[PDB]
Design a protein around this motif. Structure first.
Motif, short mmCIF file in Angstrom:
data_model
loop_
_atom_site.label_atom_id
_atom_site.label_comp_id
_atom_site.label_asym_id
_atom_site.label_seq_id
_atom_site.Cartn_x
_atom_site.Cartn_y
_atom_site.Cartn_z
N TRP A 252 11.24 32.47 -65.42
CA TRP A 252 11.74 31.50 -64.46
C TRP A 252 11.26 30.08 -64.72
O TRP A 252 11.66 29.17 -63.98
CB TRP A 252 11.37 31.96 -63.05
N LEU A 253 10.42 29.86 -65.72
CA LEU A 253 10.07 28.53 -66.22
C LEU A 253 10.35 28.39 -67.71
O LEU A 253 10.81 27.33 -68.14
CB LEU A 253 8.59 28.22 -65.96
N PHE A 254 10.08 29.42 -68.50
CA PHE A 254 10.42 29.45 -69.92
C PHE A 254 11.58 30.43 -70.04
O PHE A 254 11.39 31.62 -70.31
CB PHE A 254 9.21 29.91 -70.79
N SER A 255 12.79 29.93 -69.85
CA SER A 255 13.95 30.80 -69.69
C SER A 255 14.98 30.55 -70.78
O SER A 255 15.06 29.47 -71.36
CB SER A 255 14.58 30.60 -68.30
N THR A 256 15.77 31.59 -71.04
CA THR A 256 16.86 31.51 -72.01
C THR A 256 18.12 32.14 -71.44
O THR A 256 19.23 31.82 -71.87
CB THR A 256 16.45 32.20 -73.31
N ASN A 257 17.96 33.02 -70.45
CA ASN A 257 19.11 33.67 -69.84
C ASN A 257 19.92 32.67 -69.03
O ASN A 257 19.36 31.92 -68.23
CB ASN A 257 18.66 34.83 -68.96
N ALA A 258 21.23 32.67 -69.24
CA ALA A 258 22.09 31.68 -68.59
C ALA A 258 22.31 31.97 -67.12
O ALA A 258 22.49 31.04 -66.33
CB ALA A 258 23.43 31.59 -69.31
N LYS A 259 22.29 33.25 -66.72
CA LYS A 259 22.54 33.59 -65.33
C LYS A 259 21.31 33.38 -64.44
O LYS A 259 21.45 33.40 -63.22
CB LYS A 259 23.02 35.03 -65.21
N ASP A 260 20.13 33.19 -65.03
CA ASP A 260 18.94 32.91 -64.24
C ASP A 260 18.74 31.43 -63.97
O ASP A 260 17.90 31.07 -63.13
CB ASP A 260 17.70 33.48 -64.93
N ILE A 261 19.48 30.55 -64.66
CA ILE A 261 19.42 29.12 -64.37
C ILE A 261 20.40 28.72 -63.27
O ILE A 261 20.15 27.74 -62.56
CB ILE A 261 19.69 28.31 -65.65
N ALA A 262 21.50 29.45 -63.12
CA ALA A 262 22.45 29.15 -62.06
C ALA A 262 21.83 29.34 -60.68
O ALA A 262 22.15 28.60 -59.75
CB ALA A 262 23.69 30.03 -62.21
N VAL A 263 20.94 30.32 -60.54
CA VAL A 263 20.29 30.53 -59.25
C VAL A 263 19.38 29.35 -58.90
O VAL A 263 19.33 28.92 -57.74
CB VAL A 263 19.54 31.87 -59.26
N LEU A 264 18.66 28.81 -59.88
CA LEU A 264 17.86 27.61 -59.64
C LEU A 264 18.73 26.41 -59.32
O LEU A 264 18.38 25.59 -58.47
CB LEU A 264 16.96 27.35 -60.85
N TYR A 265 19.88 26.28 -60.00
CA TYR A 265 20.85 25.25 -59.62
C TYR A 265 21.29 25.39 -58.17
O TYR A 265 21.39 24.38 -57.46
CB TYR A 265 22.06 25.30 -60.54
N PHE A 266 21.57 26.61 -57.71
CA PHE A 266 21.96 26.80 -56.32
C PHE A 266 20.85 26.39 -55.36
O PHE A 266 21.09 25.68 -54.37
CB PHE A 266 22.37 28.25 -56.09
N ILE A 267 19.62 26.85 -55.64
CA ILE A 267 18.49 26.52 -54.77
C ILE A 267 18.17 25.03 -54.76
O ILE A 267 17.62 24.54 -53.77
CB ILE A 267 17.25 27.33 -55.17
N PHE A 268 18.51 24.31 -55.82
CA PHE A 268 18.33 22.86 -55.84
C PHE A 268 19.48 22.13 -55.14
O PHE A 268 19.25 21.13 -54.45
CB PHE A 268 18.21 22.39 -57.29
N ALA A 269 20.70 22.63 -55.31
CA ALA A 269 21.87 22.01 -54.70
C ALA A 269 21.80 22.09 -53.18
O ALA A 269 22.19 21.14 -52.49
CB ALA A 269 23.15 22.67 -55.21
N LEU A 270 21.31 23.21 -52.64
CA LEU A 270 21.15 23.30 -51.19
C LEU A 270 20.22 22.22 -50.66
O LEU A 270 20.53 21.55 -49.66
CB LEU A 270 20.63 24.68 -50.80
N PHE A 271 19.08 22.02 -51.32
CA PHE A 271 18.12 21.01 -50.88
C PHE A 271 18.73 19.61 -50.95
O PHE A 271 18.64 18.82 -49.98
CB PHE A 271 16.86 21.10 -51.74
N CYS A 272 19.36 19.29 -52.07
CA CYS A 272 19.93 17.96 -52.26
C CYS A 272 21.22 17.75 -51.48
O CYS A 272 21.71 16.62 -51.42
CB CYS A 272 20.16 17.70 -53.75
N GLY A 273 21.77 18.79 -50.87
CA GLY A 273 22.91 18.62 -49.99
C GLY A 273 22.49 18.58 -48.53
O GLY A 273 23.24 18.08 -47.69
#
Ligand code: HEA
Ligand code: HEA
Ligand code: CUA
Ligand SMILES: [Cu+2]
Ligand SMILES: [Zn+2]
Lengths: 48, 56, 117, 58, 236, 100, 535, 374, 124, 268
Positions: free
Chosen positions: G7-28
């Motif tokens: 979750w910090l040293f990541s390569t899987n593409a589907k594990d970054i979308a979840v962090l994008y969602f958790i960031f988008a909620l905050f910034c929205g």
């Protein structure tokens, strides 16, 4: 350990503190940060 | 006879495109003959009376 | 790390794909430096064997329960998309044949069975 | 041996059991200073960006 | 003129250009209303007839006559709209003999007006500056954030050309009823024209952002007759 | 691009070769999905196909789809006076006589 | 150490979308609260909350625009729905450059800090969303505030560019065995077309902002008219990015709606090739028109004529998409699940929003609407009611397939109705205010504009309640989510046909047109071991 | 006056678009060195024959009448394309298009020269005018191929006819060719212009630039389906960029130097062409060639008028007709001769000879630095 | 008879091992020629396959629309209560008074303004 | 897929990258660079030893990326025919983006030159600004760039015919011949009589001919990393993507310089 609660960065069950506190604090901070800036800049320029 | 039905959806499309345009033209010929023209008429009649007073 | 292969019949893993080295004073060739999933391609294309297939699905015959189209898989499932018997008639419908059940393709009716290799 | 160690470091990076950036017996000299100075740089740009919010200058 | 409390539509026009703008807008709204009503009716039909239906028509997906009829009809509407737009764009302007020139310089938070004519031999040019009246010093009946201490005064039925420039930042000259919205850059001169048909008072406000007191920079134009203009000009 | 007399032959042929219940329901699902109502002869083949597969619910739901495909009620009552010997020999009962 | 390598040293593409969602909620959430602060001061005439500070009002607007345009819509629409869904739909395991995915994610948190620190280290940056040159100098804004806000538009630009390059290079040479580049789903086409606009538009913005920075801090006189420069140049160099940006936010949404219209109305999309060419034409014609933003600067009389013509041609391509969606919905069966309500509320409100645009493209009529609330009310229907609705629909569509947990239908319906009412009550009277003459970016207004300003401040309090109910809906999804699949038949994405029996349906339940909905309930980390096959 | 430049731009764009849309469709009729050559030669030869007559008639009648006549001929040619189903009929339609193209080009260039009197403004306007040719050649083939594959044949010609009708409405509403106005005074005869050498070098600079192009497209290995749409794309962009840049830069740089550099670049690109042995290798040279041609136009076209204003009488038409004849002299002779040389020596040898000639002719343009005044 | 009679009130309660027994007894009862099946079996066969159980239930029941309606009403009544509380505590400038908006009316009457639709600054 | 022991090796030709720590660290270094540069320009710091540390850390992070990108193609051996095509497409789509930052600066040069303002007396290079003569050092730069474009082709045609001494010498000459460009253009910036703040002419000339300088330091680094990786036997005669990637960067910069010499130095 593939399953329904396996791809989430946070733990939801079998937890010491109930999940409600972590869930509510996130939204509280998110909706309270934009007021602290207004407070700081209002108190920096004379007005209460 | 009553046991040979071939085209039904096409007539539905033609009757639904020939009624969505009559309604549209009805609601658009009320904007240009009930909201627009009388306003211009009032505006012109006001100006055809502001000049007669100045003439007199 | 171990014995070097000379054809793809002696490649039992990633331990047989190191190879010898070049000599001092020469530009090394690809048969003297290639290790992983690169040298496997080189050893396959020098014989006529394509290691990575790109041949699409069968669109010749339909599929009956008694005589189903056999899809080869190294797992217990494989996603197969059907487009018809004339090969572009049916729209694209995706199916998941498995080792315990067969796909049946709700529109045209082709049945797919899974062969485990 | 000769300049062709390439057939000797290819038997090492495979069968390593460690991450690729910390496998050779040389990565210490690159990785200690970098991770040491990064934690100073990131700890000095958070002392002057909180010290500026209070109006303090140098 | 003055805005009205629960407004729905344009302010009253006093120059031909605003009248043309209104006419063109009412010309476009015809086609916009037609299209909106068509789409609404088709959605109604879909909701009323095809809601939880037993039969699914999964083989009507191509179209050839109908795909040409939502690609050519909209273009005809756009051409019909574009004819009067070009006619108005090229027609309405100061074709002949501007009659008066008013230089309007926009400083930080007020206005500065000069009448380029009426010059004596020594440079006695008439000039004044316009500020906003604060809420504390308003008299009984004045409008808040729109009344000024000095107001532009012009004769009726005379072509007026405004030359707009700026001294600090980008301002914007606006008088809605008169149909004037021009910009004020720091190193270029812009020009607009106006003809007034009836006497009265016309209010306006700045448009482009300039800082803290962007909401206190009103514009006020009076349209006096010729005799009153002559009397007023012999006092300033 | 297909005519009525080609539709009403192709679907007869497809109905006279179904071997299971999945196939019968598949061919019945895409028969009632065109602009042409199926002819009285095609439905006669569909009921025999449903009889070979040994299904009763499908033979009753077929008649209930004609009630929705047809435009009016007189056409429905004209379908039921020619598809009548097929019912009283196979034994199919319409839904409005069972009240399920 | 297992947490850090996943979750910090990541390569899987589907594990970054979840962090994008958790960031988008905050910034929205931040932007919505900063908008509520704006709408609580524009309620009745006078100085109500912010006591007398006209600064701290422009800062709020700038931070509300930058936060909710660059930190919510782009991350949600390109990261959580693009990184997660494209590889699964085209049949690839992971993206071509995974480390650039990680860096594109991780450049955003260091960009939020600069924006938040640009509002506390001095009076702030009240320059508007568009940082015009002659005001953003060292005579009106003298401090490290505009400087630190220009640096939040560089890191985001780098992230967007690196995402676009990866998307274009992944959909070209990482397809399955039998997917030629004409059988691709519509969402992949939308992402490709937006990733080309990001490549062709960002450098101009970077050059413009860097030149502004050099003018501020190194006294170079690019846009100062006392050395031979012109402010208008910046306008050009900004708006070349301005219009393509506005389409980058909307093209990804369109494709999402297509999928919903294809799934809950059991009919394939009407004219897919027409839709792909429509998106292509919309993308291409978004670069040749950028000067309809500046008609009042003093352009020629033959430059207005070109742009008034080149702007109205875009109406043709979008009509094709609208009429195609209507034709898709026409013949089929419609079941009103919660994604379909949002899909239906996007075909009507977006049309109302885009029709007002044809009234503002004319050079003649723009002297009555420029710098007025008409433009504002125009773009809210297309941004607030066009893109956020698509985001909510996509979430309610793909959330069960990603997390494996279902959600309550009744609370979702309540939230949708509240959002509908609030958004239609807050943005409509702005049209009347714009027509009657109210300018933009003003804290206090004359006494006449009071009434409508009191009605647009009542809808925001209804939208914030919808946001809070959304928070509780997420909570009820995460906890007891396994027992919310029997309450209603909303869980099933395709219901039985007329002839299909329940018994036969329960054996063959999943029918789709893409690999998306055939995957396991939470998708496996490595989804494709043996390649997928297409005919 | 800018509306005039827009009219000329539209005329050139529509002419080149109607000229280039066919190549999506030519394989159907054809099914290639010898057969396709006649299609190229028919338009060029007819244009070459008709340029001088229009140049002479423009003095007697004026500009707008020839412009409108070229319009009507173009519309008739598009309609004739629409209803053609034989190889022979295509040649007649091509030849009918030729006269309209010639008239439009000559009248437009002459009228732009006449209305704009200053030198720098003349160059700046002529660059943007010439950009339309490149833009139309860029736009044509993809448009034709897309409508051919989707709507079917005879649709693209109807769409182009609609666009032509829009152009004609604009021309009627702007110029209004209602009256006949002869020029102030008759110009010098074409024989006198042929006597003048500097005009001859100016014409030759344009003439020799197009040989490498004209010899190449008839012999390209393209006569899959997508290849036809993108075949001519790079040269159009190169010509567009070159014209736009050098129409502004030519006056300050010096026109002789720009012409010299452009011709040298033409020669270098032509020499580099035959090294490639695959189709994709032809991508790289074409850009350069196109770019170079643009320079040789934008610097050499205006100077003609300058010579007319420096050593003869200020009557245009004939001199720009000479320029157009020089422009078309390469497409009429190429396909009907080069293949013979292809049989005689070879294709790469012919390309190398053309490149050497292009490089050799470069020094001769130094003579135009300053000509003797009259 | 009891096993099949009135399956409309018992199907969703039985386990999945008593449901696969009735289906496997009506499938060896349908092989016999029809007209030898009782009416109860005819109803059961129709209900088991084409009936309003399982995946054929409506998305919205009658008791869910009332829930949605009264959830939206109670979500609109709270915004009204919060907005009114922010309305009593306002800064009212001196201009928003009826005796001040009637003085501006005389000024706008003297200098004739809005000769068309109307002038009025009175909004209490 | 019917070879005997096939399940022991991957079934698709794509690279599954292992977990790496560099993306986070580069972002943390860029955050420090941004904040320290935004603050140091307005006081608040004083000492100039923090900005230098931030830049050094960013560069070291990029170098530590490229180390791991080289060990995965030369030692582990995961670069099939698909991955190489992907990498080539990637590099092309970065060169394309870096070409469109020069178009903006050219449009900022044609927007002021054509239409000079009233303030400056209407003239390019204006009164009091003596331009740089284009028959001096800015000809040696063009000739050295053209020679460099030809000398790297003798390095790519000597690695396909299997000659080592002849691929090292070409790269050496190229590296020693792009250093002279930088040396000449760092000596023409000390013999000039107009700075960045004396006009709009001295501010666009030092902003389109200064970014080229930064881009040509990169070629020196890239060519050093390609000489040092050929001395150590890392390049086969058919697998060398560092040379191909570097040659498409030199030719683009030559083409760009041929546009900065006829639009900036001649035209005036
Ligand atoms: C995000 C949504 C979005 C989209 C998609 C677009 C694209 C379009 N925009 Fe853009 N626009 C904005 C939001 C958006 N814009 C914003 C926020 C700004 C800047 C605001 C600021 O800077 O402060 C801006 C810039 C901007 C301006 C400048 C405003 C000014 O002058 O101050 C204008 C009008 O002048 C305009 C109008 C249009 C139009 C007509 C389209 C067209 O693409 C829309 C096309 C839509 C339709 C045409 C609907 C079609 C429906 C059919 C049924 C077809 C039927 C056929 C016809 C109607 C003939 N936009
Ligand atoms: C991103 C598009 C966007 C959004 C979301 C909003 C949100 C809102 N905006 Fe708009 N607004 C703009 C476009 C947008 N705005 C822009 C560009 C500006 C700056 C203009 C300038 O520079 O002057 C602006 C500024 C602005 C102003 C100040 C104008 C000024 O004085 O100049 C006002 C009201 O005065 C207003 C209205 C509103 C309101 C009431 C909301 C609120 O109603 C918010 C609505 C609520 C929501 C939209 C909920 C959001 C949902 C979530 C956060 C969850 C996300 C979902 C998932 C991640 C699945 N906006
Ligand atoms: Cu002053 Cu705006
Ligand atoms: Cu726009
Ligand atoms: Zn199938």
């Amino acid at each position: 350990d593939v399953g329904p609660y396996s791809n989430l960065p946070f733990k939801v069950k079998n937890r010491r503190v109930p999940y409600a506190v972590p869930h509510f604090l996130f939204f509280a901070i998110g909706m309270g940060i934009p007021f602290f800036a207004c407070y700081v800049q209002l108190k920096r320029s004379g007005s209460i | 006879s009553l046991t040979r039905i071939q085209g039904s959806v096409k007539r539905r499309i033609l009757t639904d495109i020939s009624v969505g345009l009559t309604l549209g033209f009805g609601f658009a010929s009320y904007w240009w003959w009930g909201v627009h023209k009388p306003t211009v008429a009032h505006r012109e009649n006001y100006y055809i009376e502001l000049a007669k007073k100045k003439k007199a | 790390q171990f014995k070097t292969a000379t054809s793809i019949a002696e490649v039992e893993g990633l331990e047989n794909l190191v190879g010898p080295g070049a000599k001092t004073g020469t530009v090394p060739t690809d048969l003297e430096q290639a290790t992983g999933l690169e040298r496997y391609e080189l050893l396959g294309k020098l014989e006529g064997i394509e290691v990575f297939d790109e041949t699409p699905l069968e669109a010749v015959r339909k599929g009956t329960m008694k005589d189903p189209i056999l899809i080869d898989s190294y797992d217990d499932y494989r996603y197969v998309g059907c487009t018809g018997v004339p090969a572009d008639s049916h729209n694209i419908e995706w199916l998941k044949p498995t080792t315990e059940k067969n796909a049946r393709c709700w529109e045209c009716g082709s049945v797919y069975k899974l062969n485990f290799l | 041996t000769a300049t062709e160690k390439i057939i000797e470091l290819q038997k090492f990076y495979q069968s390593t059991n460690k991450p690729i950036y910390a496998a050779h017996p040389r990565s210490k000299y690159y990785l200690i200073p970098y991770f040491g100075l990064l934690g100073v740089s990131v700890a000095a740009t958070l002392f002057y960006t909180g010290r500026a919010c209070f109006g303090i200058k140098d | 003129d003055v805005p009205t409390p629960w407004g729905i539509f344009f302010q009253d026009s006093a120059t031909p250009n605003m009248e043309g703008i209104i006419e063109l807008h009412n010309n476009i709204m015809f086609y916009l209303v037609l299209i909106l009503t068509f789409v609404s009716y088709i959605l109604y039909t879909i909701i009323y007839n095809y809601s939880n239906a037993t039969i699914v028509h999964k083989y009507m997906n191509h179209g050839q006559l109908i795909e040409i009829v939502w690609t050519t009809l909209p273009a005809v509407i756009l051409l019909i709209i574009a004819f009067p737009s070009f006619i108005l764009l090229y027609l309405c302007d100061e074709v002949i003999s501007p009659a008066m020139t008013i230089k309007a310089i926009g400083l930080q938070w007020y206005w500065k007006y000069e009448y380029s004519d009426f010059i004596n031999d020594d440079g006695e040019i008439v000039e004044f500056e316009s500020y906003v009246i604060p809420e504390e010093l308003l008299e009984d009946g004045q409008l808040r954030l729109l009344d000024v201490d000095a107001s532009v005064v012009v004769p009726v039925d005379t072509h007026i050309r405004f030359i707009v420039s700026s001294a600090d930042v980008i301002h914007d000259f606006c008088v809605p009823a008169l149909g004037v919205k021009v910009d004020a850059s720091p190193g270029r001169l812009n020009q607009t024209s106006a003809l007034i048909q009836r006497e009265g008072v016309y209010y306006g406000q700045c448009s482009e952002l300039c800082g803290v007191m962007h909401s206190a920079m009103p514009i006020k134009i009076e349209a006096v007759s010729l005799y009153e203009f002559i009397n007023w000009l012999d006092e300033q | 691009e297909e005519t009525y007399e080609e539709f009403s032959q192709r679907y007869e042929k497809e109905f006279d070769e179904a071997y299971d219940l999945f196939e019968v329901q598949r061919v019945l699902n895409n028969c009632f999905s065109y602009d042409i109502v199926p002819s009285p002869a095609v439905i006669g083949k569909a009921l025999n196909a449903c009889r070979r597969v040994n299904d009763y619910a499908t033979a009753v739901r077929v008649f209930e789809g004609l009630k929705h495909k047809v435009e009016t009620k007189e056409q429905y009552d004209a379908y039921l006076e020619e598809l009548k010997d097929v019912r009283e020999e196979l034994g199919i009962d319409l839904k409005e006589e069972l009240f399920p | 150490m297992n947490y850090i390598n996943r979750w910090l040293f990541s390569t899987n593409a589907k594990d970054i979308a979840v962090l994008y969602f958790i960031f988008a909620l905050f910034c929205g959430l931040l932007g919505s609260i900063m908008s509520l602060i704006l709408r609580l001061e524009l309620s009745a005439p006078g100085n109500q909350i912010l006591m007398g500070n006209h600064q701290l009002f422009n800062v709020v607007a700038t931070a509300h625009a930058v936060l909710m345009v660059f930190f919510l819509v782009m991350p949600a629409a390109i990261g959580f729905f693009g990184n997660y869904l494209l590889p699964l739909m085209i049949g690839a395991s992971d993206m071509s450059f995974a480390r650039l995915n990680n860096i594109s994610f991780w450049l955003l948190p260091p960009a939020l800090v600069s924006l938040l620190a640009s509002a506390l280290i001095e009076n702030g940056a009240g320059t508007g969303w568009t940082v015009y040159p002659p005001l953003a100098g060292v005579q009106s804004h003298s401090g490290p505030s505009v400087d630190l806000a220009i640096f939040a538009l560089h890191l985001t630009s780098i992230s967007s560019l690196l995402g676009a390059i990866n998307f274009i290079t992944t959909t070209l040479n990482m397809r399955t065995i039998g997917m030629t580049m004409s059988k691709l789903p519509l969402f992949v086409w939308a992402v490709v077309f937006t990733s080309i606009l990001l490549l062709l538009s960002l450098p101009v913005l970077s050059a413009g902002v860097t030149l502004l920075l050099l003018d501020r801090n190194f006294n170079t006189s690019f846009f100062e008219p006392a050395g031979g420069g012109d402010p208008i140049l910046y306008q050009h160099l900004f708006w070349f990015f301005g219009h393509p940006e506005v389409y980058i936010l909307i093209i990804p949404g369109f494709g999402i709606i297509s999928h919903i219209v294809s799934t809950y109305s059991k009919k394939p999309v009407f004219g897919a090739i027409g839709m792909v060419y429509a998106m292509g034409s919309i993308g291409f014609l978004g670069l040749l028109v950028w000067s309809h933003h500046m008609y009042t600067v003093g352009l020629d009389v033959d430059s207005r004529a070109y742009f008034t013509s080149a702007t109205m041609v875009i109406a043709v391509p979008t009509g094709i998409k609208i009429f195609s969606w209507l034709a898709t919905l026409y013949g089929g069966s419609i079941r009103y699940t919660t994604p379909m309500l949002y899909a239906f509320a996007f075909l009507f409100l977006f049309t109302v929003g885009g029709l007002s645009g044809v009234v503002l493209s004319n050079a003649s009529l723009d002297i009555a609407f420029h710098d007025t609330y008409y433009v504002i009310g125009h773009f809210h229907y297309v941004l607030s009611l066009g893109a956020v609705f698509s985001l909510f629909a996509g979430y309610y569509y793909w959330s069960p397939l990603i997390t494996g947990l279902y959600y309550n239908n009744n609370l979702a319906n309540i939230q949708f109705w509240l959002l509908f009412i609030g958004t239609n009550v807050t943005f409509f009277p702005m049209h009347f205010l714009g027509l009657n003459g109210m300018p933009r970016r003003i804290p206090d207004y004359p006494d006449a504009f009071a009434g409508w300003n009191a009605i647009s401040s009542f809808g925001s309090l209804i939208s914030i309640i919808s946001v809070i109910l959304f928070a509780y809906v997420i909570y009820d999804q995460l906890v007891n989510g396994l027992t919310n699949k029997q309450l209603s038949t909303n869980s099933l994405f395709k219901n039985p046909d007329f002839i299909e029996s329940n018994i036969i349906f329960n054996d063959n339940s999943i029918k789709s047109s893409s690999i998306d909905f055939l995957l396991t309930s939470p998708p496996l980390p490595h989804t494709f071991n043996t390649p997928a096959i297409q005919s | 006056r800018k509306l005039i430049l827009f009219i000329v731009f539209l005329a050139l764009l529509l002419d080149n678009m109607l000229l280039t849309v066919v190549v999506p469709i030519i394989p159907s009729y054809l099914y290639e060195n010898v057969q396709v050559g006649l299609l190229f030669a028919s338009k060029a030869t007819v244009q070459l024959i008709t340029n001088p007559f229009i140049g002479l008639l423009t003095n007697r009648i004026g500009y707008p009448i020839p412009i409108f006549a070229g319009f009507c001929i173009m519309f008739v040619s598009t309609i004739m394309f629409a209803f053609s189903s034989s190889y022979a009929f295509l040649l007649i339609a091509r030849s009918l298009q030729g006269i309209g193209s010639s008239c439009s080009s000559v009248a437009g260039m002459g009228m732009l020269a006449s209305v704009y009197t200053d030198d720098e403004e003349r160059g700046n306007v002529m660059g943007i005018a010439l950009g339309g040719l490149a833009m139309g050649v860029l736009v044509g083939p993809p448009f034709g191929s897309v409508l051919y594959e989707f709507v079917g044949k005879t649709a693209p010609f109807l769409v182009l006819a609609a666009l032509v009708l829009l152009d004609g409405a604009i021309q009627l509403f702007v110029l209004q060719p209602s009256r006949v106005q002869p020029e102030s005074q008759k110009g010098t005869p074409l024989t006198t212009l042929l006597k003048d050498p500097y005009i001859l070098i100016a014409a030759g600079s344009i003439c020799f630039a197009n040989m490498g192009i004209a010899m190449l497209e008839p012999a390209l290995p393209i006569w899959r389906k997508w290849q036809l749409g993108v075949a001519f794309l790079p040269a159009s962009i190169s010509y567009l960029i070159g014209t736009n840049i050098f129409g502004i830069l030519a006056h300050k740089m010096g026109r002789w130097l720009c012409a010299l550099l452009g011709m040298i670049i033409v020669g270098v690109s032509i020499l580099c062409i035959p090294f490639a042995k695959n189709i994709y290798g032809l991508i790289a040279p074409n850009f350069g060639v196109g770019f170079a041609i643009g320079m040789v136009d934008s610097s050499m076209m205006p100077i003609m008028g300058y010579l007319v204003d420096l050593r003869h009488v200020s009557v245009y038409g004939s001199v720009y007709a000479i320029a157009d004849v020089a422009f078309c002299m390469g497409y009429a002779i190429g396909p009907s001769a080069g293949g013979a040389i292809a049989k005689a020596i070879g294709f790469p040898w012919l390309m190398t000879i053309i490149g050497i000639i292009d490089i050799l002719f470069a020094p001769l343009c130094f003579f135009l630095r300053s000509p003797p005044a009259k | 008879n009891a096993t099949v009679t009135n399956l409309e009130k018992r199907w969703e309660d039985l386990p999945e091992t008593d449901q696969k027994d009735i289906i496997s007894q009506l499938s060896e009862r349908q092989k016999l020629p029809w007209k030898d099946l009782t009416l109860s079996e005819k109803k059961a066969a129709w209900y088991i396959s084409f009936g309003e159980w399982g995946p054929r239930r409506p998305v919205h029941t009658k008791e869910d629309k009332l829930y949605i309606f009264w959830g939206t009403v109670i979500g609109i009544v709270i915004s009204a209560t919060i907005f009114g509380a922010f309305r009593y505590n306002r800064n009212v400038p001196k201009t928003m008074n009826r005796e001040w908006q009637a003085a501006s009316d005389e000024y706008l009457k003297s200098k004739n303004a809005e000769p068309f639709t109307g002038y009025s600054q009175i909004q209490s | 897929m019917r070879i005997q022991n096939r399940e022991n090796l991957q079934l698709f030709p794509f690279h599954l990258v292992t977990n790496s720590p560099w993306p986070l660290t580069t972002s943390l270094a860029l955050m420090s660079l941004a904040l320290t540069l935004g603050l140091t320009m307005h006081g608040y710091i004083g000492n100039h030893l923090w900005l230098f540390l931030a830049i050094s850390l960013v560069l070291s992070s990029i170098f530590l990326w490229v180390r791991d990108v080289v060990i995965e193609g030369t030692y582990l051996g995961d670069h099939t025919i698909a991955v190489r095509k992907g990498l080539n497409i990637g590099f092309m789509l970065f060169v394309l983006s870096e070409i469109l930052i020069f178009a903006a600066l050219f449009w900022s040069y044609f927007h002021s030159a054509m239409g000079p303002t009233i303030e400056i007396g209407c003239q390019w290079p204006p009164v009091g600004i003596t331009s740089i003569k284009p028959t001096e050092l800015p000809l040696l730069n063009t000739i050295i760039l053209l020679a460099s474009g030809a000398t790297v082709t003798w390095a790519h045609h000597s690695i396909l015919y299997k000659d080592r001494q002849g691929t090292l010498v070409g790269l050496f000459i190229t590296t020693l011949l792009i250093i002279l460009f930088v040396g000449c253009q760092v000596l023409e910036y000390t013999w000039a009589t107009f700075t960045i703040a004396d006009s709009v002419f001295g501010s666009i000339f030092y902003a389109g001919t200064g970014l080229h300088f930064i881009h040509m330091v990169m070629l020196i680094v890239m060519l050093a990393i390609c000489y040092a990786r050929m001395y150590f036997y890392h390049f086969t005669s058919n697998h060398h993507l560092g040379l191909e990637t570097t040659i498409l960067y030199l030719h683009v910069l030559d083409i760009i310089w041929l546009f900065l010499y006829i639009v900036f130095y001649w035209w005036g």
